[PDB]
């Protein structure tokens, strides 16, 4: 109802200042929406958790899960030349999900 909010505040050489009472509506809308993005992406589709996952027990930080994953792939017994069997790799990852 942005036009029906501009007009009320209008109804109470100050022309630039008249326009200056129409920008705080955009500022409030963005202030609620910047919230909306970050809160939505942290309470509903958790962004801090998705990123802290992307760091820990994943590519950045091994932890112990990635130790359990890595030793199996290093092991020379029953190892194919490049050991690129995707089903085996995926199975090892699900064994080492640990969460």
């Amino acid at each position: 109802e942005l036009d029906d909010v501009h007009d009320p505040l209008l109804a109470i050489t100050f022309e630039l200042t008249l326009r200056s009472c129409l920008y705080p509506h955009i500022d409030k809308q963005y202030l609620d929406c910047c919230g909306n993005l970050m809160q939505t992406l942290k309470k509903d589709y958790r962004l801090v958790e998705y990123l802290q996952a992307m760091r820990n027990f994943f590519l950045m930080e091994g932890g112990d899960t990635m130790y359990d994953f890595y030793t199996s792939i290093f092991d020379k017994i029953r190892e194919k030349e490049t050991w690129q069997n995707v089903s085996f790799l995926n199975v090892q990852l699900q064994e080492a999900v640990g969460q």
């Binding site: 970050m38 801090v48 890595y70 290093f74």
Partner: protein, 151 residues
């Protein structure tokens, strides 16, 4: 893989010495990359994204954090000058552990002196490459590891 391979690993006594002359170097590189660069940087990223309040700035800060880890780890800019040295002295470790297995004496390895000289001179090249950073380059990131204790 390199540290674990030299871990999986363990003239006949001189091999035991060369193991040690190698593990120090690889473990020190691992120490720098694993903690000094990635952990410390990830901590201010974790803290600062709390303060950040924008969808676009949250992208910008994330891109800065990735552009700084990817640079502080020796993986951009000069590659033949720096990276291949660490790669080849890693490759020597990989051969050194690939050509050995646990529990016998008769390895019949006469290349031990060749690999000694190789590791020694490539190490000389590595430390001199890092010392060249004094004139130009990322001195905070390099002069921290250039103090590798040499010998």
């Amino acid at each position: 893989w390199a540290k674990y391979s030299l871990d999986v690993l363990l003239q006949i006594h001189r091999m035991f010495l060369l193991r040690v002359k190698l593990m120090h170097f690889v473990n020190s590189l691992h120490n720098y990359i694993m903690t000094r660069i990635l952990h410390s940087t990830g901590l201010e990223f974790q803290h600062q994204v709390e303060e950040a309040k924008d969808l676009d700035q949250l992208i910008k800060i994330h891109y800065r954090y990735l552009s700084t880890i990817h640079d502080r780890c020796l993986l951009r800019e000069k590659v033949s000058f720096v990276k291949e040295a660490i790669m080849k002295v890693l490759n020597l470790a990989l051969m050194f552990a690939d050509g050995w297995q646990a529990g016998l004496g008769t390895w019949r390895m006469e290349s031990i002196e060749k690999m000694e000289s190789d590791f020694k001179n490539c190490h000389m090249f590595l430390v001199t490459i890092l010392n060249k950073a004094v004139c130009r380059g990322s001195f905070p990131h390099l002069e921290s590891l250039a103090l590798s204790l040499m010998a």
